[PDB]
Design a protein around this motif. Sequence first.
Motif, mmCIF file in Angstrom:
data_model
loop_
_atom_site.group_PDB
_atom_site.id
_atom_site.type_symbol
_atom_site.label_atom_id
_atom_site.label_comp_id
_atom_site.label_asym_id
_atom_site.label_seq_id
_atom_site.Cartn_x
_atom_site.Cartn_y
_atom_site.Cartn_z
ATOM 1 N N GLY A 1 53.905 28.193 45.344
ATOM 2 C CA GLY A 1 54.962 28.111 44.328
ATOM 3 C C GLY A 1 54.736 27.840 42.959
ATOM 4 O O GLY A 1 55.316 26.895 42.084
ATOM 5 N N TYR A 2 53.551 28.061 42.587
ATOM 6 C CA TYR A 2 53.182 28.167 40.987
ATOM 7 C C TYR A 2 54.119 28.889 40.253
ATOM 8 O O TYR A 2 54.349 30.159 40.414
ATOM 9 N N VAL A 3 54.432 28.096 39.203
ATOM 10 C CA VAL A 3 55.608 28.760 38.302
ATOM 11 C C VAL A 3 55.330 28.420 36.654
ATOM 12 O O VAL A 3 55.863 29.100 35.850
ATOM 13 N N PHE A 4 54.125 27.644 36.673
ATOM 14 C CA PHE A 4 53.682 27.500 34.987
ATOM 15 C C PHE A 4 53.535 28.772 34.573
ATOM 16 O O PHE A 4 53.034 29.868 34.883
ATOM 17 N N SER A 5 53.868 28.869 33.154
ATOM 18 C CA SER A 5 53.834 29.913 32.113
ATOM 19 C C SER A 5 52.446 30.760 32.158
ATOM 20 O O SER A 5 52.725 31.867 31.823
ATOM 21 N N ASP A 6 51.392 30.277 32.570
ATOM 22 C CA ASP A 6 50.277 30.870 32.456
ATOM 23 C C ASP A 6 49.752 31.792 33.648
ATOM 24 O O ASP A 6 48.858 32.500 33.749
ATOM 25 N N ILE A 7 50.928 31.908 34.711
ATOM 26 C CA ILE A 7 50.933 32.634 36.094
ATOM 27 C C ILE A 7 50.544 34.129 35.487
ATOM 28 O O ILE A 7 49.914 34.924 36.352
ATOM 29 N N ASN A 8 51.093 34.789 34.575
ATOM 30 C CA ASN A 8 51.055 36.135 34.158
ATOM 31 C C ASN A 8 49.772 36.266 33.655
ATOM 32 O O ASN A 8 49.105 37.227 33.780
ATOM 33 N N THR A 9 49.125 35.394 33.029
ATOM 34 C CA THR A 9 47.796 35.645 32.489
ATOM 35 C C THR A 9 46.737 35.753 33.620
ATOM 36 O O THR A 9 45.748 36.271 33.744
ATOM 37 N N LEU A 10 46.986 34.651 34.600
ATOM 38 C CA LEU A 10 46.074 34.774 35.594
ATOM 39 C C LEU A 10 46.146 36.002 36.532
ATOM 40 O O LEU A 10 45.285 36.500 36.938
ATOM 41 N N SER A 11 47.489 36.380 36.460
ATOM 42 C CA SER A 11 47.708 37.775 37.269
ATOM 43 C C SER A 11 46.876 38.918 36.553
ATOM 44 O O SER A 11 46.572 39.624 37.243
ATOM 45 N N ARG A 12 47.164 38.997 35.213
ATOM 46 C CA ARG A 12 46.328 39.866 34.488
ATOM 47 C C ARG A 12 44.909 40.167 34.893
ATOM 48 O O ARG A 12 44.229 40.811 35.091
ATOM 49 N N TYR A 13 44.261 38.788 34.729
ATOM 50 C CA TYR A 13 42.728 38.735 35.107
ATOM 51 C C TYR A 13 42.600 39.031 36.524
ATOM 52 O O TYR A 13 41.453 39.637 36.872
ATOM 53 N N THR A 14 43.395 38.628 37.686
ATOM 54 C CA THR A 14 43.071 38.852 38.944
ATOM 55 C C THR A 14 43.283 40.322 39.277
ATOM 56 O O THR A 14 42.498 41.065 39.899
ATOM 57 N N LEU A 15 44.427 40.972 38.573
ATOM 58 C CA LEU A 15 44.577 42.242 38.818
ATOM 59 C C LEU A 15 43.463 43.295 38.338
ATOM 60 O O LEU A 15 43.235 44.370 38.719
ATOM 61 N N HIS A 16 42.878 42.813 37.096
ATOM 62 C CA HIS A 16 41.693 43.624 36.591
ATOM 63 C C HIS A 16 40.545 43.349 37.434
ATOM 64 O O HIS A 16 39.800 44.172 37.645
ATOM 65 N N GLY A 17 40.430 42.259 38.072
ATOM 66 C CA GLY A 17 39.290 41.971 39.081
ATOM 67 C C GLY A 17 39.356 42.771 40.289
ATOM 68 O O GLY A 17 38.322 42.973 40.787
ATOM 69 N N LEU A 18 40.466 43.228 40.515
ATOM 70 C CA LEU A 18 40.728 44.142 41.783
ATOM 71 C C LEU A 18 40.411 45.657 41.445
ATOM 72 O O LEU A 18 40.696 46.612 42.318
#
Length: 1762
Positions: free
Chosen positions: A787-804
């Motif tokens: 249930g991670y809701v912190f505002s930086d979840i989209n930045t981490l999602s960007r980094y992860t999706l590039h990593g994929l």
Amino acid sequence: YANEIIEIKRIMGEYNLLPDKNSRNGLKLLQKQADLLKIIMEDTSVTENTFKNIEIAITDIKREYYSHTVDIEKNIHAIWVAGSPPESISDYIKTFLKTYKEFTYYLWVDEKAFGAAKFTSVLKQIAFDLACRTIQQNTPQKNIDFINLYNEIRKKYNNNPSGQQEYLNKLRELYATYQKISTPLKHMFNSFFLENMIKLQDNFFNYCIVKGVTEINDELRINYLKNVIKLSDDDIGNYQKTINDNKDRVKKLILDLQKQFGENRISIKDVNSLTSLSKSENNHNYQTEMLLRWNYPAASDLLRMYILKEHGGIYTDTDMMPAYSKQVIFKIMMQTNGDNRFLEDLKLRRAISDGVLRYVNNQNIDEVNYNEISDADKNIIKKILTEISKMPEDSIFTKINTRIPRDTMPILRRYHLWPDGWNIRGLNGFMLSHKGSEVIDAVIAGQNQAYRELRRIRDNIHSEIYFKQTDELSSLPDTDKIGGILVKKYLSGSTLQISGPDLIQRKMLQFFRSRGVLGEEFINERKLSDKAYIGVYKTTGTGKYDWLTPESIGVNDVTPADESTWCIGKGRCVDDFLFKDVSTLKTENLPELFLTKIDTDTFFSQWSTKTKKDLQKKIQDLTVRYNELIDSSTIDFKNLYEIDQMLHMIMLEMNDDIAKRSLFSLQVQIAEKIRRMTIPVDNIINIYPDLHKKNDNDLSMSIKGFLASNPHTKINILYSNKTEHNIFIKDLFSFAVMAFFKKHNENIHNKIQRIKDEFKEYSRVAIHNIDKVIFKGQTLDRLYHEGYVFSDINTLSRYTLHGLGITGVHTEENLLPAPSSSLINILKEHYNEDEISAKLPLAYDYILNKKESSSIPVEILNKLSELPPHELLTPVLGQSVNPLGMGYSSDNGKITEQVIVSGADGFDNPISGLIYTYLEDLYNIHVRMREGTLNSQNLRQLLENSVSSCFLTEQSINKLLSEAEKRPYQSLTEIHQHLTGLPTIADATLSLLSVGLPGTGKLLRREQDYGRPPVTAIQDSTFVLPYNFKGIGFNDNIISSAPVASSLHFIAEHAKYTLLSWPEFYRHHAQRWFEMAKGYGSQNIDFHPQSLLVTQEGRCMGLALLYLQTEDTAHYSILQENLMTVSALHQTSNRDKLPLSKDDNSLMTRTYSLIEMLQYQGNKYITNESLLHKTAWNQERITLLFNEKGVKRALISTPNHTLVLQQLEDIYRLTDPNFGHADFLSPIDALKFIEAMIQLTPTLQEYYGLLNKDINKHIQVHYAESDMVWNKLLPENDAGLSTRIQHTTTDRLANLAEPVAVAGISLPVKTLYDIGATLDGRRITSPPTSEQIPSLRLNGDVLNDYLSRTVLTPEQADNIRKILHTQGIRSGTRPIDPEMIRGTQDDLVSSQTRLQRQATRVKQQLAGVLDTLQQHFQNIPRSSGRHLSVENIELADIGSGRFNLQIRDGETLHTTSVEVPEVVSRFQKLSTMLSALPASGIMDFDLGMSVVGVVQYARLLQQGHMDIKQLSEATLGSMIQIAGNKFLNTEGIQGFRLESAVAEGMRSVATRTGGTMGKALSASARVLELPVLETVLGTWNLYNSVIQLQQATSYSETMAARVQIAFDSISLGLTAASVAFPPLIIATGPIAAIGMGASSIARNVARKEERHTQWLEYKKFLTDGSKHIVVASPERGLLDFSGNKVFGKMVLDLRQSPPLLHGESSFNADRKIGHRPDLGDWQIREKVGYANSISPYSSLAHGYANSKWPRTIPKIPSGEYD
């Protein structure tokens, strides 16, 4: 308005509860109040009484706002300029001390920069000498007299040191001479001078970094000068002399002033006692200003801002007097009977001020300078002065208003009466402010940005030298104008200003605009109002201004020592110049300008003996690897890591300083190389929106803009359903603690669906759910579950999706493509640079949508509508990033994470892995912190075996533990900030990289403090932010430096060639290409056709630029071999649909990304006339360019294609990417060959777009003014394509000498890979281990291709069958019948090879035939369903291949017109060969094999027994049958079958010409006679049933596979079963055919026919004899020379790894001249004189007396032959 109303109430409540309202918070609250009031006003339904109430409230708020004023500090600040004579200083200082009694005067003196003038003079001399040398050595077509005169006068000085003034005067005359040089040379001079000066400043800053200095002084400058040049003791003495002179001058002045006015009244302040000097955000711009300034006698422009910010008060220029009091001006005006001419013109004002200053300081009145003044004016001024001297000293001058509004810097306004009119402008020579003013911070930030943009000429590697921008007073520091000013100042010694009054005024205007409604009184017509200045005068309703009672009290600036007198009255000083000979430059210490390889002979020249014996051997172990890394066109990060780490260790293990400096120079070279080698970016953008706003118009506008900017850009919209659910649950919990579920789900789904269906018709727009691509165990999935809701979840999602593996651009903002230069130019016809930014949103709205705005002229809209949208917007294509693989947006020089640009697929991405590991570490720290189980010990274990342990300091651990105790639940970004102390993860990227890159990473981090860009920051921005339309780059301005649009070649909806039929184009024209090239004098013709691009979109610009890059024959050969390899890989991957190994796929993707980027860049460059010159086709002009103007490369552009002409070494090479290259001895021969080739051949002319067109106006030649333009334009990171030979997986596996034991039989790893051995779903790249053998699987498609391409031995076939039976076909691929795997004996290998080649040729021909038939059927109106049903296959014309087809479509449609000579001509040749062969025994084995395969394919089709594709294929089969029936059935027998007649013909041929060839022909005929084999029928039916239906490939591949099956069925008849343990030795050689020699042809030649026909027969014999000199089968170790007939004195040398073939070719001869291979067709024609010199090339005897058979000696492939 409820929310905003609550806002105003809350803000008023906050304002009322303020202990001190006179502060920034109160002003901000009042600004918010006024803005919200304006928002309320903006509503349409507002009553007039409401209008009045809002206006009254706003006026009251404004009156309250302006009541907040500050009293400035009682400080007067002046900056002492080195060399200033105190006599002209003390008078003004005394005047200001007398007028302002309650003030302290500070003289700011920098004792550490007393000698900086000589240092900068030496640096300028070095920079200009380097620029002159580059200009001279780059332009060899002519010499420049200015450079010669410069060097001559410098040499003249080198003899006379005493005559400085003589040198300066000679330099002035030489500038007068220089003014006559050509404009391009002037532009290049300006650019080179500025760039070299910036590079030298960078070198000095690197010296500061390596020496570890904290302050810069004169001793450091002297040491650096000794480091770069040879400094004698006389120069050091001169430096010390000027330093001591300045010290004595300032000491004497301050002592004389303190004696009179006291000690505390006036004092000296140290410039180094300023915190702004050492601030990192200022980038040491104070030191850079010392060098890049052209107003030397003036004081620094940054120093005054620093002083005002840190102390406040008054800054005044030295040469300024206080304003006259009211009585003084009244006396002036009524002693001149009202003559205003004595208060407006400059000369009389200067005289009056001179007299007043002389009187106040008790000096002689009569000595006033009265020159250029009439005698009557002199006398009346004398009377004025006599009257003024009567006044008391306390009433001459008046003070100024020291009460100013908070956060403001009043600027002196200047009134000057020019002949044209009144000159009014602000001056930074007198300013007021209080300590800590905000506008000062804004001005400082503006100055820093100005220096950042000035450095762009050096920082941007792809910066164009030639760009003549018009004069428009742009905010950008135009580098050309600044460079010209600097050159003029350097030469002559005497407008533009980066940080002058114009920039200050612009920054204050922006600040007041940002203030809001409270700043509207400071803004007058988008310009600073009169309230922002002091000394303003109101006009008395006339042209003149009422001097009486000024609106604000100013200061007297017209003085005897102002700007207008020291230009000539004060001669140029001699202590600001130091002559130095640049010939003694130590280029080894200047890595920024010179790339020097490490030479072991001279590298350790200055080292000590101890350090040499310690580490010279260690350094010598690096030389080869370091030089390879430096010279490479790609970056191998393993070598970089190793070299950098061991260099860092060696530097750490040293005590010397010279050795340390040399190794630091090596590190600097590495850092510069890393900066230069950028890599392309994928044409993809990924937008991560938040589904919580209520306008999608921004997102829709972004998507539309990126769709319109380019027709190939992919757009991904990425969202997370789990994140939305988590936010919903968190909101519910917050609501409860302090029907909804279905409603929220419906709302989110509705928003997503609306976005999805708005762009339903565009397949490039894909809306993806993030919770579908991430894996279960990844960090992001765990965060979603928690249930991670912190505002930086989209930045981490960007980094992860590039990593994929999702590449391209990742952003959360609604980015827009940046405007192109064309759109900016269109807008510039009506707007200036500060209105274009505001007008851009309307232009974008009109371009993307069709909205018309009444605020923009209709002419602008009409001009916009006439251009394509992709010409007005900048696409993602063509962008580049740093080789580290990650790029970030910037904001005021600080990297942010609004935009993340992530490399290109296939390129190394070092930052991605570091980010992935770092995110794991942050997640682990997070989960330990949630449960409270985090201590120092557990933290150390968590960060152990992680590069992130570099952040583990004692204070960092303590902060992490304290924050864990205070708040156990924190975001990953907060945890990262606590662990590292850096704001963003992008900042931590360089720290993570410096673990594996010590020294180089540390140096790159250190250089950020000195103005250098961050290595991970993108510089050129192709995006703008939606809300204010500003770029996201580092040093870019989207208005003044908009990029040029790229020309997009629109292509037809149908292409003439597909990948299958593409080789037909090369096959039809290769012979003619070679013949024309040889007949026009070419002595070396090479063939390397390309199969990468089968369409003409892009016009082969990428390949043309790739070939243009090379300047050497060796690099050309390397690039050509690499391109052939990539073409083969692309054919395998796309035409055959075969999987590639990971490395091969990476190489192909890298090459394709580079090709696409280069194609975009080239199509951009060719249309930009300011970059590359463009001329129409004219052979004389191009010859003049290549001979007189020193042009070495050119691009020849046809409407559809691009050719390349080069000057490699001493030859001129013309490259056609589809046909290889040919080189000539002179450019004129090459141009003649180009014209003849493109014009004589009709099919090639039509393909190249020159059909029925004047080639003289449709062929353009593109070249560069100088050769360095190409070095500036073409990328340095080639992915190794032109420096090293890239090896495929097969080549690497061939080197392994060990066999692999599979199924009890040992076979090489290369063979195992070749048959398609896949391990866990990937093709093997390494020898599998014994435990992996059972898991091996065979790819069916790869095995089928291998069997169709290879002629196995029977034992090899047995081994393959055993491996197949014991391992099996991988699921989902083509099953293989084991009965189809057979081998052939040695004598039949040539026949099988020729059969396979014929199979390939027939497939490629029938593909094009089928495509033609499909298009023909597609141009027929067909109704619902498939009723085409062609019902006739009648043929009309035989010589052309014309067929008439009856169409039973049901609506009586009939189109009996098709052209298919491919099918008819083959049977015609077969028929004539069969009939005339008893007389002429020469036969064609390949023709017979092709006919047999074609008829077998037709028979297999016939046994098959209904859309367009299959109907067209059946039509092709019927046409084959019809052609065979027509050409083989002489008598109309109803019971005639093609197969039997074909078989009988080949049986007769075989039995009449014996040997192994006859045996093969008889075997093929026997296969034809017998019924189709059960295995062959099974394969055919299985394919057509499941394999064709399962795959989604088009019909051409299916028909090619059917043809391949038929030809394999034919091949099966040539195989033999293996025999084990032969009891006796037998013969295994091929048997010769009857009639091998040339007597057989002479038997029929003796028939009395035309002599040229007899020669045609002889030439056919020679060509057939030379066609098959060698057939090589390295797989079975077989070499076959049985087909050699015309290659005499053959010598085969098997001792070399690739066997060496030598021999003598057959040749033509002439009775008179003999054989002359060195001559062309025209030269031979002249030698023997058989025609006129004006005869057409078609009338000559091509190849006469200069032909060879074979053309070139064949090359044997490397292998093991026995």
